[PDB]
Amino acid sequence: SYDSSSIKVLKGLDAVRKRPGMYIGDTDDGTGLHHMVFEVVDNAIDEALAGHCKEIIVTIHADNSVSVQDDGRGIPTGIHPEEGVSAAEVIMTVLHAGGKFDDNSYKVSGGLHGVGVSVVNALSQKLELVIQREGKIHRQIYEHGVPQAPLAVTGETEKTGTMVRFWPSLETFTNVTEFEYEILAKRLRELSFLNSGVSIRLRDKRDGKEDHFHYEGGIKAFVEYLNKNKTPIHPNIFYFSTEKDGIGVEVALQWNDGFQENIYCFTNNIPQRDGGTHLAGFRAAMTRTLNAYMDKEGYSSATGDDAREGLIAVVSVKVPDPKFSSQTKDKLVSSEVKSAVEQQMNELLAEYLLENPTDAKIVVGKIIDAARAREAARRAREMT
Amino acid sequence: SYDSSSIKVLKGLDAVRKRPGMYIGDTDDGTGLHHMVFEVVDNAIDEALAGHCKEIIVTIHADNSVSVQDDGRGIPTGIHPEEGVSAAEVIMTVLHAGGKFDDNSYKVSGGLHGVGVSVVNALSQKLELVIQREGKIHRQIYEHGVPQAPLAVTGETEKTGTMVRFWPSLETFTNVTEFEYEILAKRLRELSFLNSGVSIRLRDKRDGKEDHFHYEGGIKAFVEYLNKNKTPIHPNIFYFSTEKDGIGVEVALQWNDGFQENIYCFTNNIPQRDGGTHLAGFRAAMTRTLNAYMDKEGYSSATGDDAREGLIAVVSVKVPDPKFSSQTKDKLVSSEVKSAVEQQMNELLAEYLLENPTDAKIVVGKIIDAARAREAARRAREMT
Ligand SMILES: Nc1ncnc2c1ncn2[C@@H]1O[C@H](COP(=O)(O)OP(=O)(O)NP(=O)(O)O)[C@@H](O)[C@H]1O
Ligand SMILES: Nc1ncnc2c1ncn2[C@@H]1O[C@H](COP(=O)(O)OP(=O)(O)NP(=O)(O)O)[C@@H](O)[C@H]1O
Ligand SMILES: [Cl-]
Ligand SMILES: [Cl-]
Ligand SMILES: [K+]
Ligand SMILES: [K+]
Ligand SMILES: [Mg+2]
Ligand SMILES: [Mg+2]
Ligand code: NA
Ligand code: NA
């Protein structure tokens, strides 16, 4: 019988355990598992974006838990008047709850849904929260998202910060159940390039391995690092950072003598593996600007794909309220970011080409060469 | 000051309006807008999967609203004891609320999150709900997700069904704000192929256009339709439907003399544009099975990509609890579906090749040809 009794409302964090795919992604291949860490790291990076955190420590513990310590402002501890429990507990236990729904606590933040750490909490067999704030140390333990006692003061400190340690639930995660140093290291290295002046440490207590990421030079250096085992064909990396019409657009790029295209897109320091409106705007401006230059200089027909070949590019945007298609934020679905990136690229790339004639002539040569190889491949196919 | 007062909990449907990207996708390019219709249609298709709905009517109204009428069981109308309002209102107003969290009301359903129609309601300036059930007509109106009065009985009927008409909010949707007949028609045509015996009608009150989709022949016919303006190279479409280990796997495919690959994947009748574990399993089985056949018959080196060229395939799986990465369900993230598709394909495709030697020899020829064209393209590139 299909009737009112058949309709069920999931409460608290039950929806997260029931439908983990829409909150954490794939619970079998390891991507969801490492995403648990990235949610916690993203919250610390948001304190760094806000100007309050200068050191982040990620530790893989020997019992297969992970901790993230930050020296930010600390998760608020006072009783939330509407909810009747510490703000920290609200945050850990309530979906669509947080401090990122306006721009008062974080001007710009990767976080926006009020969901991330509460998902981590929901899918962890245990979670330990330690908060240093207003002279005091606060502690609380959760099991499968259920707080064991209310947040309590345990001592004094001159410091501020948040430490979250979590033990993932094997009732949720299957197959890849251990953390992979290199997966975490890739992301943290990236975050160092994206956050100059923030010390990011990674420690593996299983084997004693550690890294300290504090790169100089931001996304321009990131482009160098990425071309390190390749052969750049021109010496001057194109770079700019602007803030126009409420949107930050930062781009670095350089061509190498290979044939792959590697464009890394980020929104508020969160990578979009599946691209989005920022990537679309970058592509459109690149195609237009190179075409105009080749027309004006009398080198002209090469398409957007020919420009792509040998390209390494980083596109980092800063947006007050971006729009992602999912909690995992693999794709940016914000049309106004396409226009901002496209506009800034069109203006500044055209200027780069004019100020750097040697590089410009090399890049044109490369585009023409890619076009020549494409047409030869096509002729060869047709003839078989 | 960042403190407990800075932490906000979004209630009811406020989170949906605040962060529409994670619920509906892109609110500017039209995809989110049409997805509003698809959520409502999916709920009717679920009544059809359950065996209770035989006719679905989709109408685009002249005032830019859309209605979906189904002749299913009807959304439950009785007071929900826990929530204190009609089950219908719970459904329309509460996230993670519905009848698809077990398999008692729907054995198999595209719906699983308890979110879809409540998102439609949240992002509509107005929504009209009419429910025919247990001898009675029930009606309710919402504005921006707020019910105007409680669900009320308005008359009598011998029929059963649900009608939802919604007017999308222009406070959410921008730029593409009108419905496109062809976008709806593509999906409904697909759904007719996927649901043999279900009459699906589409009517546009703006211009009088209509369609009635009731295709014979299921996904095998779907493959024909897709190859209609192309040139199939072998006459016998490979087809099977099995249900093993709790999973339905249904596949049809055929090669044409073109060079594109078009694999259409579905889970509980919902398309995955971004593929997933079903697509991964299909690819893996195809590659293995063709290779083994070419080895055994002495035709052997061609890769998975060469097999892909000229392929049209439909892969339709039926799963008790699938896992998607998002509310829009663009990607299936369920590892056990990869194994089920891979296993069934390996067994049944090998049998197809043995029972259809003429087709098998043609397909081998095509693979070898694709391989030859690929190597010639590569040589041609290298030489420029
Ligand atoms: N390390 C931290 N330091 C200070 N405040 C924090 C920290 N981690 C979490 N918070 C607070 O907890 C809130 C909720 O976090 P979370 O559940 O991850 O959602 P969110 O960051 O707001 N958005 P999202 O991650 O996109 O779902 C944040 O908005 C902050 O106000
Ligand atoms: N046309 C319909 N006929 C009968 N019951 C329906 C119909 N539409 C919705 N329902 C009921 O309303 C519930 C909630 O629908 P909805 O909010 O779309 O979530 P869902 O279908 O369960 N899952 P999802 O669409 O993946 O978020 C369903 O689970 C059904 O129990
Ligand atoms: Cl009822
Ligand atoms: Cl506080
Ligand atoms: K939260
Ligand atoms: K609902
Ligand atoms: Mg967060
Ligand atoms: Mg639904
Ligand atoms: Na914000
Ligand atoms: Na179910």
Residue numbers in the entry:
A (entry chain A), B (entry chain A): 4 to 303, 309 to 392
The authors write:
The focus of this study is the ATPase domain of Escherichia coli DNA gyrase, located in the B subunit, which functions as an ATP-operated clamp that captures the T segment prior to its passage through the G segment. The N-terminal 43 kDa fragment of the E. coli DNA gyrase B subunit comprises the ATPase and transducer domains. The latter domain participates in nucleotide binding and plays a role in signalling the nucleotide-bound status to the rest of the heterodimer. Evidence is provided for the existence of two monovalent cation-binding sites: site 1, which preferentially binds a K+ ion that interacts directly with the α-phosphate of ATP, and site 2, which preferentially binds an Na+ ion and the functional significance of which is not clear.
Refinement against a data set collected at 1.92 Å resolution from a crystal grown in the presence of both 100 mM KCl and 100 mM NaCl (‘K+Na’ data set) gave a model that was essentially equivalent to the original K-only structure, i.e. containing a K+ ion in site 1 and an Na+ ion in site 2. After superposition, the two structures gave an r.m.s. deviation of only 0.13 Å. Moreover, the geometric parameters of the monovalent cation-binding sites were closely similar to those of the K-only model. An anomalous difference Fourier map calculated using data collected from a similarly prepared crystal at a wavelength of 1.91 Å (K+Na-anom data) gave peaks corresponding to the site 1 species, the ADPNP phosphates, several Met/Cys S atoms and the previously mentioned chloride ion. However, this time there was no peak associated with site 2 (not shown), which was indicative of this site being fully occupied with an Na+ ion. We equate these effects to the occupancy of site 1, since it lies adjacent to the site of ATP hydrolysis and is capable of binding both Na+ and K+ ions, but has a clear preference for binding a K+ ion even when presented with both K+ and Na+ ions. By contrast, site 2 is more remote from the ATPase site and our structural studies indicate that it favours Na+ ions even in the presence of excess K+ ions. Nevertheless, the values for the N-terminal portion of the ATP-lid, including residues 94, 97 and 100 from site 1, were noticeably lower for the K-only structure, and to a lesser extent for the K+Na structure, relative to the two other structures.
